[PDB]
Design a protein around this nucleic acid. Sequence first.
RNA 1: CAGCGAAGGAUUUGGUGGAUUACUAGCUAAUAGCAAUCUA
Lengths: 125, 39, 213, 806, 823
Amino acid sequence: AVPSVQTFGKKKSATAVAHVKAGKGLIKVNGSPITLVEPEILRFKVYEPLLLVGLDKFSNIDIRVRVTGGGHVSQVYAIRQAIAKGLVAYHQKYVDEQSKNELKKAFTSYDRTLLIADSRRPEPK
Amino acid sequence: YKLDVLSSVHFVPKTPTISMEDAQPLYMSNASSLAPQEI
Amino acid sequence: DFEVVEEFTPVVLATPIPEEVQQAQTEIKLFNKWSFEEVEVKDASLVDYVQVRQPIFVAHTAGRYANKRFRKAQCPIIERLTNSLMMNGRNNGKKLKAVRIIKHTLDIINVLTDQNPIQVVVDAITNTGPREDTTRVGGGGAARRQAVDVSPLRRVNQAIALLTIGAREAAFRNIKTIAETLAEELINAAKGSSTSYAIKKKDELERVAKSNR
Amino acid sequence: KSDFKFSNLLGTVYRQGNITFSDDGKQLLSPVGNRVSVFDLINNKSFTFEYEHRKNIAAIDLNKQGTLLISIDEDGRAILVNFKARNVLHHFNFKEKCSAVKFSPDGRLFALASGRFLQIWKTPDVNKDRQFAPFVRHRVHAGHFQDITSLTWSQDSRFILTTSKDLSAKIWSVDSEEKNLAATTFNGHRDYVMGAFFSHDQEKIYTVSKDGAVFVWEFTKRKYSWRITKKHFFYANQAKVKCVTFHPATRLLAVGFTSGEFRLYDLPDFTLIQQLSMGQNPVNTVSVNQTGEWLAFGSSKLGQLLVYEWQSESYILKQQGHFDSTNSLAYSPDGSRVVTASEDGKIKVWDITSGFCLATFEEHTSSVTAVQFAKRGQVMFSSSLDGTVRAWDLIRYRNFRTFTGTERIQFNCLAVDPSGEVVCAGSLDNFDIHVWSVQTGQLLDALSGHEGPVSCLSFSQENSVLASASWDKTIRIWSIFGRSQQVEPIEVYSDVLALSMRPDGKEVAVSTLKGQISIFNIEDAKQVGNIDCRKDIISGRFNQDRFTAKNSERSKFFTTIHYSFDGMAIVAGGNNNSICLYDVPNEVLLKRFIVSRNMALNGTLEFLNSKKMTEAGSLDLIDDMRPEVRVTSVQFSPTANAFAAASTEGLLIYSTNDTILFDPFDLDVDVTPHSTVEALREKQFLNALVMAFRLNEEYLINKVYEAIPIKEIPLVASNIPAIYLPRILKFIGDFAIESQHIEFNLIWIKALLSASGGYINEHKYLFSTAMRSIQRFIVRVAKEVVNTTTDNKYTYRFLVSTDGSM
Amino acid sequence: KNSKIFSPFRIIGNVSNGVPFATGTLGSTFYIVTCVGKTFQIYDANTLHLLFVSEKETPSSIVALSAHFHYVYAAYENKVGIYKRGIEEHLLELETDANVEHLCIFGDYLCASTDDNSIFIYKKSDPQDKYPSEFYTKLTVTEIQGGEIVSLQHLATYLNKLTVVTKSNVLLFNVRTGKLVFTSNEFPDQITTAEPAPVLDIIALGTVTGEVIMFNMRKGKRIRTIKIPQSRISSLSFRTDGSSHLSVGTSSGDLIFYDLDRRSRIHVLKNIHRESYGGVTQATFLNGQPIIVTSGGDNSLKEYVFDPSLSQGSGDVVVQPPRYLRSRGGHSQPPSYIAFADSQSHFMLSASKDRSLWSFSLRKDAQSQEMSQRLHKKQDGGRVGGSTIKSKFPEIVALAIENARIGEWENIITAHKDEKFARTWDMRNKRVGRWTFDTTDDGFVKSVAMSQCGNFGFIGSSNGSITIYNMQSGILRKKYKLHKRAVTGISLDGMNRKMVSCGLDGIVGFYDFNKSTLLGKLKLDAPITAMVYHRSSDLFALALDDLSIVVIDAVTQRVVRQLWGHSNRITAFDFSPEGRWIVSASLDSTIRTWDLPTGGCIDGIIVDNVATNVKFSPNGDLLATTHVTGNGICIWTNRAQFKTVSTRTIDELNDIDFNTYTSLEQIDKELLTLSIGPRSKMNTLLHLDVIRKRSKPKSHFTKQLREGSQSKDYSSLLATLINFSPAAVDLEIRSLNSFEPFDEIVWFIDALTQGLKSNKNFELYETFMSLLFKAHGDVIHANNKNQDIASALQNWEDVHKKEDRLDDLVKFCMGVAAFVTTA
RNA sequence: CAGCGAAGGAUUUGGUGGAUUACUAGCUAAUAGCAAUCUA
């Protein structure tokens, strides 16, 4: 029916689900607004997917993010990964694929840990 | 040949004086291609 | 003259974002207060060994800078400073506390001497990094040493270590917190005023290197 | 710069049709694929025609003026081509499957044999312009009952003698006013008559059956009409005749059989001259030069041909190719000779100046997967599914080392340290990278870390770190040497194929399975950028698949990429019919080539014809499998802008000819080729040189370069500015490799890299393809000339200074 | 005028013009010979493919054609051309200056008629040959006998008679004795059509008022009359499959099917052909066939089939209406704008003044089909605007193709006349695209372009703004605002780095993408009306209004060339795909070619109609021009691809003329020089013994040698010696007949001495010396210190000593090259 | 709910016709006859 997309995002044990759909521009983490996200010093670590590329790309979508597990910094990395690749997948499916790889170029030039988590560790020396 | 042609994805094609030996190695007009150790 | 119009409806989204944040979307500043550009490593020989060309928001990038050899000389200098600042037996792991206390530190660095505190801490590093030392060579097990020179990675690392442990030792049993103690240590190191712990230890080490040269 | 015309097709020296010499015994026309190759024998060269047919071609002929040829494929889509300009002239659709076409000795009428009808047409002209309908039909004759098999003329253009799978063989007069001169019909053979020939004077008519019979018709008496005078015979037992030709003036018959044998006779005496074989598969086509010195034999199934001089038994060229087994490619580090590794397990070695092989290596049992060169030109390694990575010296042209595993696992990719001290191979079923020392053949180690099969390997050409890529969606960087053995992983989105790292050894291009190609700087783990290469590769819908070409996902990815040699442009090829090339700074496609436009290959068309679909099953899955189109491995040449791609029809080789282009460089209103020629005739040589470089017209470069005299080549080679050195260095290379003024070229090179050696020294990667062509030129003509002139010097000195008389 | 670069080839995309066609049968086939202006065309009628064309044009326009079995009789200004398979087989010049009007063919007597009621009839020399070749006589109808002529034909079963149909009377002839036989009655109004009937000896003839008289010429009466209100009748026919059906065609675009057995209208057809282009010019039943071939003047040919009846019992009373069957058309007005679709030069696009868009195919001329104006529905809830009636689109001005993402999203863009937006299309599935790209500043669209990565579209409005769009969503990306009047040309690079804007103000703005700043501005001193970017070579050629073609390279922003020499507005350019030439056509009825290296004008064709648009093919073989008049599109073949052409500035050394350059033999005698040709001659000569030993299966020269010996120069000997085969060289040089004197050996060593004295072919002279040394150097070592051969070897080494500078040079160069490529 | 929006809008599906390869006319006993017939 309504155009939606669901993406994930994982730090150590925290897991973030992101439902991105066409909307009016509201970004919610467990119903809380995006501004009211603890521990208040990594609010910009949460902000940087919606801040690197400008809010005009967020004007037509609305995002709801569930988070489980992990501590504080793991939850904020999971949130920002889910937000980022949800925006990328929405632009891959429903709008400009040129805007998709523009966004992918921006996020990968900043840090690709905002798009792909670094899973397979450790090393037996 | 028959077992690995059916176990694959890409297609596999399959007295007088001489059979003329068209697939020859060693040829830049070479006669003593041996090493001096080998001599 | 000339214009470029990219946006055609202003930013009015349903979760109303703070205005300083949607002003920071035009250009990235550290902590939404300090622009990383017009900040230069005044010295040579530490340029491309103190990362300042890649701006960040907070000093908590979670990259991997210890698996290869020299790639800890590419994570930015502010969180290099805060990772050395977290190191003591009482307070390991607490890098969020470390981030917020260097936030208060470089904030009062700005409100005392206002150019920008990232420039203050960059030329503090360039002035504190020692340029020679010695090595305790054997020599028959005598009192024997020989002056050598210092590679710039060791210079930057030893400067950061000297600044952080000097702030800790000057804030051990005083009224001042580690925040303002690191602030005054960085200001004295930026002037090179021969007063702070790191510049004193640097000139001492170069003095004994010149003596035993 | 990026306008790669289709230059040559290496491999597959003949597949299907009829060989044909030119008028002058210089060029041999071979029906290679859907195209025609031309092998120039004396000027030891070759090319392939750029035009293509929609199926495999089946008839070649050019007129005796050597001006235009026609070529006819399996359904009669005849295509004629200006031979001296290599462009197409007109397409035509003869309505049924042709068998043989022949221009006249006059060359004004060509007749062909479509099915049972023969038809004479008159030719168009090279001099008269390109008309809409140029073919004017002379006549069409229908005297036969089954398909015509062969066709000949008289020595003049008056009678035409045809022969068929109908047991008879007949004759015809080309005008309507010589009907009494020849209208009869020669019955009498047991099987398919496929030879019918006039003698040198037109009175004897030799006819040749399929089962080895030769009749000699002659217009003699018991008015009197064409009595058979003799039934000579062949008596090859299970070898019925496959192909016949007959040189009239030297009176030479040449017959190839089913048994893979040929014999040539002196026919009017019927004396067997030569009887000998080329293999166990039939000689499909004989043809003979007009001067009778040379013959040409093509055998289709092994794909071989052979031009044989029968007076003095000296073989001019004997060659054999492959088909749809061209599994990998390499260049020699001087871009002069190519190595083709083929899936039946053999290592052909071609060269680019000619078109011929010079050495196979028939060693491996099962397939050869990948090859590459190492250690300063003359070692190349080959890696198989036998369980063998074996070395090859390319001077003694022999094996010298064979590394195996410990358990016979099939290998899939290999790399080798540029300092040729370690050789690394990766498999499908062991998850490891095997490292072997090469100076001692023992297994050095096996290093692990993946959990899927390693798809591709590489070594960095400068700092010797290794980059592997595997189906764990993972690329992994090993630093092996120097006391450490340090690994570093890098995740990627989908699983990986086709790693290829830059000649600086600073970054790595990987070709992931989702249709994307990423680039990773290897000093960091940081991705520089990636090209979405999916929506710009046309993947042909097959004959048997029940999905569209759009939703198909057989080949929507790449399987071999390679850099250019400045590190600026990735060429890429996959299991689809597109080979693309991109430029990595702007991250954009800049050209896409299609590799084949014939439906004989499977996956060419993305939109199949609807009329072939039936109530059940398409009309091409009804047998009376079809080979897919793939490009298995693609490489840029070291010493050209040219690049090669090993597809199912052999090596395609595309190239730049900067001759036909206007590709200037910051000119303005005053600078003009007339202005450079006046600047040369008023002799300001430096100004005329840069005034020609700005035009970038290579014939002005040729003219100014030759007209500069010797006594100031140091002066102009000093004063030439910095931004023209890549152009002048690569020009001197690619002109000097086939030029003649050797001392002039060497004076120019000595002047250039004496006056400006240091600038090259600090811009090595700017001139990497520039002064590799120069070194190819040095060590592959000039060092040889010096070798023979020193041999003459020493043999003179010995034959004078020593004595002896007994 | 005649040309020297481009030869004209064919006017494609053209079907009919309005001349009444003819039809012919062959066995059980049917071919339609239609006229297109000057040449004609032969379609078949089953699949309606093209089959033939005239191989060369006519002097005037064709006014009337007919067709017997194999032969086509064309008729223009004074002649009648008997043609076979589209090739002219016999002219027939008429014995007058009067222009021919109509003709008919029957039996032996051909019969043509001029425009003054004079009828030349011709006769076959042999009652067995194929066509009437010989003049028989000249009848002449006078104004007493009837009006001025309008048709003539021989209706059937008449012994060498004929029927001339005037404007007022019908009048027969006996063409053997040249006699009139039966003038008919008087007819009270002008008649304009007369076609015979398949029943015995009657002819149906229709007037300018809408009545059809059915004259019975044997009876001399009329049998019936079909009355029709105020219809200018144009073309009758009859249906001959048994069921009798008359079919009239009215020049108001009507086709009326009358039954005749019960005098009833079976079915009318309204607006089948367009009214204003002539209506139904010619419509006929194929005989023994229940189909209809109509042709209008509006460049359209149609087939209408009659279905079998649905009443299996009643049958002929219930007649199903005519279906529509195959048809071939072009657009009926001269084409405005012209593009080439693919790189293979297979499809091309036209958009015409009658507001239709076509995809012509210049490969096979039954593949040409109209693109369709059926809007994709708005899937967000909106309703389609415009009007309720589906009119065609407004007139197309500009358009742009990029076949890079073809069919995956929208492909081509267009730019319509004086409407505020610019809709887009698709070329793969051939219909109108989803979106309409809009200018957002009320200015009409004047320039459109798109990136060669197929994503970004580019609208350039009349108010100077350049809005860029994405073409897989239809949304806007950014709005470049620099100009202050109508932007006339947009382009972007191959690799999307820099883009170029081109206004009417004279400002040419060099912008770059990915950083939306500009980086260059140029001001030319004229208004600018066109820009063609050569995406390969980064030049782009601009029109001006002081008639210059200013070529600017986009990198260093220089004005790199300025082509002067036109007299009126330059309507079009195209780069040659190599980028060497600019072909430009202009309103002084000229089309010139500029060789932009030399800046010169190679040739100028004086074309009779002003060519509006000029386009080169992706590959350099076809030049398609479209003119002021003519419904077609004329494609031109450049002979420059098959032969090299000059470069010489015309107005109504040969190497730099023909752009080539041969290499001289040697620069001077001081320099070495290898042999011209293969560099494998050296290896084959040095190894041909082991070459043949591995390739084995398991005198004139001596005459010339003593000639050159006694003349004491061996240059003719060396010219003989160099250039023949290695086998013959070794077989000759192996036997040199030297037992006591060795004069032949001294002559040969002195010959090689004189050869490498010149410093030429010295690799060959070295290997000839080495061949002799391997051949019979044993006798030289044996009777060494023989005075003659020792003198020959002494001065041979004394000339050989000069060739040590070569190894000094190459062992310098190799060592220093290895040093600068490694260290 | 809204707006878009010229005497309707938006979908499902059959049949026919044109393409999906590069356009030299049909038949036969074929240097010609036929196309109304190859028969005497």
